[PDB]
Symmetry: C2
Subunit: 443 residues, 2 copies
């Protein structure tokens, strides 16, 4: 639906699939507000959420409420901006206080977005909402299109700088600001250095690497992971894309049980569009690529469901079964990212993870781990057996007191990283998880 | 409309046109009419127009220097090894063998979904019925009476379903990779609970088709036991799968399509194990040096508008180069067993034979080694996992160290 959905006399779920140009998060809510409706606009980033309030004030004479976990600006207004996470943290839909709920950037396959969107899909009507718009410029199945404000040019094997099978010639990047996307930290570094060898000032940016990129529009080539979030990104004469990315994948390896790991795969449509798009911000730019292909958008990994369950327990006080209610509505609602149906399995494993250690859980949460619940739970079983974590990496920090937890074999329940210690596969909970896999996972 | 007319220079066009074009009838006859001798290639198939197959094209060695002006690679969305290798070979040799136009024809382009079907009364499934079909349920008033086809992803899934049905009064016949005619040919009311092993061309004349919307595919795991593992995976079906599953119903009659899940995937990428198959097939079938395979595969990968895959070209070419001194006799045998990776099977058999050791398991994949009198040597030197390993293994054979190294170097 290219136009902003019309609020119906009775509850309904509409899909607004308009380009990033339409003010889906700004012009749209303002429009509904002007009709007298109370709208809630949800986005994945705090950057975004906080940003929409500013714009609105000036650009739309609307001073909205901006709810973020770190800042909750409240000014009794029909338009409320919040991140899916703060939404989920605030109890969900939790009052008959919105006529319209815009789930913006609804194509996001991060745990907090899927859980946040399924929560709306399951509570809006009952909460007194007549419209829930699933907005996105990249619906599932989308392949990147274009806007000739960007000239796309295939890299070739001819060139002084070796690049993912191809080669970047010096004449394209030396002289000007350019952004080169690499799938990993190493590549970012190894590329920057070699770029410097040839007399260019490359800046390798990635996770935990404080923003060291130069704002001044001088000459520079920034080689980085996607960790360079958008928003400020823009003044680059071009971008050179490796056309790949690292993704979290679950592996039902059957070591004791499953493994959360990564795989580097061809990028999908939103990744390319997002990478490509960091040039051509007013002045026409160029996009140079290693591969002419990608994968369409709208498919996420089972590990993300595992994440939704890990979030429900750790941050949202949701019994695995309440989480399955929310995620099931997401999987029952058409026109959204797709993933293999593993709700019974995940719900099944998390329900058996009873009596987690409260302190360990606080620690793993504050520490910003990917799976605070699965981490603190493995720590919990280890401590109760007086056994050591599977490795002494940062992850298992909360068990720091390796002294009593000396007795070797760790009762491994699953693998969230590299396992260094000798393990044992006979813990009741390990065995419980294997039954859940036999019970809900075929082969 | 029409296909891209023959240009002044050689180019690669995209007849991303469906059945409404006649890519296997009218698109060729058009070019033939203009005086052009066309070669049309499909997974399955004088006058200036030859209709063939990709596999037959590889068997013949590819493009003949001066034979066709037009080459249409039909069903260019096909990601089975032979199709990938065949399209890459055309893309690599086309021009130099005198071709002016290469049209990549596909009824379902990238990012394309379920087709507009004006006859199949398609309906969503509701959770109503005591025939729970994949988390939901089926109403036996839909299956009792008339001929039908339910698609499950597994053999054992087909088995159990046909079973719950028979205990409810329905004539259910399970069908998967095995015996046909299990479905009666002219007796109605039958219900076939099939795996995709029942090919589309078969057509059991069905009233409806209920789809589980899932699929099983071959995938490789870089498991690092010794090296890698050829295995499978279940994933949401895609726009191509739905089309072929739902296109099976009626065929002459209107028909109906029932489905569990609302989603799928508009086509997509193909696994790295298919890359392995191409190197395996090149070695085993086409007398192709790994580097020749790499050239043809790179041609495919450099062309826009084709399914994508991970760039493992160097890795695979690297592992097959180290697959030295294979037993010509085991390979002749694995090739005729209709094995999946005849080269890799025949190679693992050679290192066992050489070592006088038994295969990983005694599954019929290893029938070339039935002289297990001396090949009883307890530990089998595991080069990789192609199936279930039931025998004690050793991981010190040089080829194992070689593949591991290739992994380290080529895979991050
Ligand atoms: Ca696996
Ligand atoms: Ca593992």
């Amino acid at each position: 639906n290219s136009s902003p959905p019309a609020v119906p006399q009775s509850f309904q779920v509409a899909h607004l699939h308009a380009p990033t140009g339409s003010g889906k998060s700004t012009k749209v809510p303002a429009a509904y507000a002007a009709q007298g409706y109370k709208v809630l606009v949800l986005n994945p980033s705090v950057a975004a959420t906080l940003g929409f309030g500013a714009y609105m004030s000036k650009a739309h004479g609307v001073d909205p409420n901006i709810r973020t976990g770190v800042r909750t600006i409240t000014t009794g207004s029909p338009i409320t901006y919040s991140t899916y996470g703060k939404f989920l943290a605030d109890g969900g839909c939790s009052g008959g206080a919105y006529d319209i709920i815009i789930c913006d950037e609804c194509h996001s396959t991060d745990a907090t977005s899927i859980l946040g969107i399924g929560t709306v899909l399951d509570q809006a009507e009952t909460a007194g909402a007549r419209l829930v718009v699933l907005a996105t410029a990249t619906p599932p199945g989308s392949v990147t299109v274009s806007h000739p404000n960007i000239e796309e040019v295939a890299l070739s094997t001819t060139g002084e700088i070796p690049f993912y099978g191809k080669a970047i010639p010096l004449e394209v990047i030396k002289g000007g600001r350019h952004l080169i996307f690499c799938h990993s930290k190493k590549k970012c570094d190894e590329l920057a250095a070699k770029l410097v060898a040839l007399g260019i000032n490359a800046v390798a940016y990635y996770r935990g690497l404080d923003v060291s990129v130069i704002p001044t529009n001088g000459d520079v080539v920034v080689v980085s992971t996607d960790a360079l979030m958008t928003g400020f990104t823009g003044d680059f004469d071009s971008v050179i894309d490796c056309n790949t990315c690292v993704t979290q994948t679950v592996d039902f390896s059957l070591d004791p049980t499953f493994t959360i790991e990564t795989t580097t795969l061809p990028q999908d449509a939103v990744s390319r569009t997002q990478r490509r798009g960091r040039t051509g911000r007013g002045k026409p730019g160029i996009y140079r690529f290693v591969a002419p292909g990608e994968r369409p958008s709208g498919m996420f990994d089972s590990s993300v469901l595992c994440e939704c369950y890990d979030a429900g327990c750790a941050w949202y006080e949701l019994m695995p079964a309440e989480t399955t209610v929310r995620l099931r509505a997401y999987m029952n609602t058409p026109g959204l990212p797709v993933c293999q149906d593993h709700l019974e399995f995940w719900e099944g494993v998390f329900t058996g993870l009873t009596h987690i250690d409260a302190h360990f859980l606080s620690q793993t949460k504050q520490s910003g781990e990917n799976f605070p619940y699965l981490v603190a739970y493995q720590a919990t079983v280890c401590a109760r057996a007086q056994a050591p974590p599977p490795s002494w990496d940062q992850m298992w920090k909360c068990l720091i007191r390796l002294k009593p937890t000396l007795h070797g074999p760790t009762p491994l329940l699953y693998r969230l990283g590299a396992v260094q210690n000798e393990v044992t596969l006979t813990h009741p909970i390990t065995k419980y998880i294997m039954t859940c896999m036999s019970a809900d996972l075929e082969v």
